[PDB]
Structure 1
């Protein structure tokens, strides 16, 4: 029927509202609208304290380079560390929101990381996977959803 588990929260509803500064370019702020752009996007919860986050990063670059749109959700992290991080490993993201308060994660039902949402063009959350992004997950679970909500263009 309808899944009742905490990983199924927000499935089928609009991204929570927020206002967060960009980690990449200080001074610039963003809101739910940035994830509501008429095309599907991936939102990827990450932080320097997240132990499996490095393990998923290079495949994050790979998708980013084939035109899969990815927005960073830097979760309760240390600003300077996060910067140093993106610098050594590469920057896959359109931008990372600096959720240094943890408010947005909290709004999204996030506990620990990394985690990846597929949000459609209308800002609606369609899928949520806890754990590392990799070619299996992509090919099996996410790719069909990305095509589904891209063809709605």
Structure 2
């Protein structure tokens, strides 16, 4: 849906790595110099499992995806990745959902497009499928990929 963050930088945060206990990340990790997709997901989200296989496909094509596990059960989340594959370059654990609150998410799943400079450029509330990618996000990803280059 619509977002008041379009054109604004990613909110400050300090979250623990989902699969690397003790390692914490900050917003600087979302300023890669290349565009990135931030995917909000959880194991309790039905369309998330279905969307996971498509994310694996995009990741294999070079699309950079950062995963934000939302108000979820950490262990179940880790098993989820070991069982279905890990498309994420990095996985953040938003156990309390505080980053989700600053991002204005309605729930899961949701995908944000962030440019190389850490500026939020698009927000899609709902599952990521070929149609959404081809019609809504792909054109934007290509634009910011060419500029970052």
Same fold at TM > 0.5: yes
Tell me the distance in 2 between the aligned counterparts of 1:135 and 1:76.
26
- Could you report, residue by residue, the CA deviation over 1:94-120 in whole angstroms, capped at 9, with x for unpaired residues? 111000011000000012110000000
- Equivalent in 118, 134, 138 of residue 143 of structure 1: 138
Report the Cα offset of residue 50 of structure 1.
Answer: 1.0
Instruction: Number of aligned residue pairs: give it.
Output: 148
1:112, 1:140 → 2: CA distance? Answer: 22
3-state DSSP of counterpart to 1:14: coil
The equivalences for 1:104-115 within 5 A come to 104-115=99-110
For the aligned residues, what is the CA RMSD?
Answer: 0.9
TM-score, normalisation: structure 2: 0.96
| Structure 1 spans left out of the alignment, 5+ residues | 1-5
Native 8 Å contact 2:106 2:125 kept in 1: no
* TM-score scaled by length of structure 1: 0.94
CA distance in 2, matches of 1:37, 1:112: 26
2: CA distance, partners of 1:69 / 1:146:
10
2:23 & 2:105 partners in 1: Cα distance? Answer: 24
Deviations 1:14-69 (A, max 9, x none): 01000001002112111111111111000000001112101101000000000000
Question: Which residue is 2:34 aligned to?
Answer: 39
